[PDB]
């Protein structure tokens, strides 16, 4: 019965950005909701970061919808 009041940050600081850059492309299933849950960030920030890495070519797009987007990692070889 723990409350643990949430404080989701709006803009990326120094450390969360490079932990994202080292962990998010090594995830099997990539979703804005699950990366916001894992990194304790806001939802719009997660969408902006995944759009940025989609433009950077490190993220493979699968399906695009108005409710959610689904992303996956690239092959190691």
């Amino acid at each position: 019965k723990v409350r643990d009041k949430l404080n989701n940050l709006v803009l990326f600081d120094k450390a969360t950005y490079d932990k994202l850059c080292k962990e998010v492309p090594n995830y099997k299933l990539i979703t804005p909701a699950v990366v916001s849950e894992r990194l304790k960030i806001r939802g719009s920030l997660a969408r902006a970061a995944l759009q940025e890495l989609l433009s950077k070519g490190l993220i493979k797009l699968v399906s695009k919808h108005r409710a959610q987007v689904i992303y996956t990692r690239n092959t190691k070889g």
Partner: protein
């Protein structure tokens, strides 16, 4: 860019009230009493600030620009029907009023109604429903 900039102010003191910087700039100034969701869009449209930015990272020039726009609506091509106080009973001019001024104007309006002893002022003094609705069943939490 996506990294937080330097001197990102967490709070704001616009018109002596605390305004957070985490909310959207089209919606953080909604917490200022007297300015709502619809009024915040026109102020940020006459002034050249995009509405996709956050509240705590804008600079003081555009902050004071939209502040002088909010205290001076009509001199920036804002139409007279967009104002919350049109044709005031004392001075007779269109002037949008802000928070403490809004409370003062409402207080003196209720004082004027009680002084002239109209039915609306009497119902406001008694503390009942004044707009003319049924009070037989609804409004149970007025007293114990």
């Amino acid at each position: 860019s996506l990294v937080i900039p330097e001197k990102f102010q967490h709070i704001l003191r616009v018109l002596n009230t605390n305004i957070d910087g985490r909310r959207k700039i089209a919606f953080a100034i909604t917490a200022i009493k007297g300015v709502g969701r619809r009024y915040a869009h026109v102020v940020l449209r006459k002034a050249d600030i995009d509405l996709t930015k956050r509240a705590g990272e804008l600079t003081e020039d555009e902050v004071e620009r939209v502040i002088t726009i909010m205290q001076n609506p009509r001199q920036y091509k804002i139409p007279d029907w967009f104002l919350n106080r049109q044709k005031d009973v004392k001075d007779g001019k269109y002037s949008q009023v802000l928070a403490n001024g809004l409370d003062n104007k409402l207080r003196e309006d209720l004082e004027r109604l009680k002084k002239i002893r109209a039915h609306r002022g009497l119902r406001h003094f008694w503390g009942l429903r004044v707009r003319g609705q049924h009070t037989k069943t609804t409004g149970r939490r007025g007293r114990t």
